[PDB]
Amino acid sequence: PSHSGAAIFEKVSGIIAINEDVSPAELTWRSTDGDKVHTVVLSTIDKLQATPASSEKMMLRLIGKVDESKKRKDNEGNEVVPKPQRHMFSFNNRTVMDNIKMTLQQIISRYKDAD
């Protein structure tokens, strides 16, 4: 339960499934048919996000880590923040949302706090 839930990815529906049997926990969206499987090892993830409670729609994100371009500002100042490569999953259940929210958030943060 607290690792998966029916999500939608690339215009097709399925389940999102976080697996910790493996090397650093990976999130796996697999279509309802099971043909499409996309695995995201959470160690490569920097953040994760979800739809605000004001919005009815259900969404999670996987914010993958970025280039070390978090480096200091440019000679022209620029003031740059490196654009993250992220994933977005559509659900239609708040319980799933909150669980997937928590599941991803915590494991990600386990790699951050590292305790």
């Binding site: 739809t51 605000p52 004001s54 919005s55 977005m88």
Partner: peptide, 19 residues
């Protein structure tokens, strides 16, 4: 084209709360 709006509505919904 569509994914582009997906990052828009996320901020739009955020700017709603950030009034």
């Amino acid at each position: 084209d569509t994914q582009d709006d997906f990052l828009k509505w996320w901020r739009s919904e955020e700017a709603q709360d950030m009034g």
